[PDB]
Amino acid sequence: KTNGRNAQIKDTFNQTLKLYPTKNLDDFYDKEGFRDQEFKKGDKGTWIVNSEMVIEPKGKDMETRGMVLYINRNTRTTKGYYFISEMTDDSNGRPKDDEKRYPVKMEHNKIIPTKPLPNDKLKKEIENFKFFVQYGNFKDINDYKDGDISYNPNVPSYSAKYQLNNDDYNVQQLRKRYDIPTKQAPKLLLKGDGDLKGSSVGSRSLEFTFVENKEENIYFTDSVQYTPSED
């Protein structure tokens, strides 16, 4: 059904999905996204890339691992960090939570820690890291069936939700790169806000939701966004 802004919503999301894959992160130095007057004249923009695997099983410790990189096209340098967040409850129900960040830089499509690590295995996990934009690959948005499109014109914000099967290319890639403890086929959720044609201030992201209830949350989030740079 093409009511309201459903077609415009699908169109903007297809523009996000078109970026999958971009195997060489250096390519971002030469990609120009959408520009407004939030970019100061001489600023060429920064590409922020972020992938995170959230695994919070029922009745168990919670853990998230991911990375963020800031690809600055002005300086042609890229810095960010890998992180491991852990949230646990001691026997009295008291939180014992932490998050550790390991600074890194990107050079010649390689991930290089800028501080040493506590062990070799973690060093390799950081060096071998691949953002979802480096191996994801979607079909045209319109090829995904029975989409649930939502639109709040006041923000404005929007979303498109689809049920995927376990034979989906992307799902198979996630199960190979991560130890996801759930047989369930995930939903793909596209989210956006700000002008439908695009904006600097606005956001675009995606998620693969394997489980979502009050006791358990297992999901994967990814975003690739063109933003004004820091001065």
- Tell me which stretch binds Ca ion (CB under 5 A): 88-96, 127-135, 194-202, 207-215: 194-202
| Residues that contact Ca ion, how many (by CB under 5 A) | 1
Residue with Cβ nearer Ca ion (47 or 102): 47
Q: Tell the smallest beta-carbon distance from residue 147 to Ca ion (Å).
A: 21
- CA distances, 150 to each of 103, 144, 198, 224 (Å): 37, 16, 17, 22
Q: Does 136 bind Ca ion (CB under 5 A)?
A: no
Helix/strand/coil percentages in the chain, nearest 5? 20, 40, 40
Q: Tell the smallest beta-carbon distance from residue 194 to Ca ion (Å).
A: 6
Handedness of CA 92, 52, 199, 231 (dihedral sign): positive
Q: Tell the smallest beta-carbon distance from residue 60 to Ca ion (Å).
A: 36
| Buried/exposed 3-30: b ≥16 CB within 10 Å, e otherwise | eebbeebbebbeebbebbebeebeebbe
Q: Tell the smallest beta-carbon distance from residue 4 to Ca ion (Å).
A: 21
Q: Tell the smallest beta-carbon distance from residue 20 to Ca ion (Å).
A: 16
Residue with Cβ nearer Ca ion (16 or 168): 16
Q: Tell the smallest beta-carbon distance from residue 76 to Ca ion (Å).
A: 22
Residues 195-214, mask of contacts with Ca ion (x by CB under 5 A): -------x------------
- CA distances, 186 to each of 59, 138, 174 (Å): 21, 15, 11
Which residue number places its CB atom closest to Ca ion? Answer: 202
Residues 153-192, mask of contacts with Ca ion (x by CB under 5 A): ----------------------------------------
Distance from C-alpha of 40 to C-alpha of 30, rounded to nearest angstrom: 18
Listing from the earlier edge strand, what are the strands of the sheet with 110-113? 110-113, 95-107, 77-89, 62-72, 46-56, 217-227, 203-212, 187-193, 157-163, 148-152
| Contact by Cβ (8 Å): 191, 184 | no
Q: Tell the smallest beta-carbon distance from residue 209 to Ca ion (Å).
A: 22
List residues near Ca ion by CB under 5 A: 202
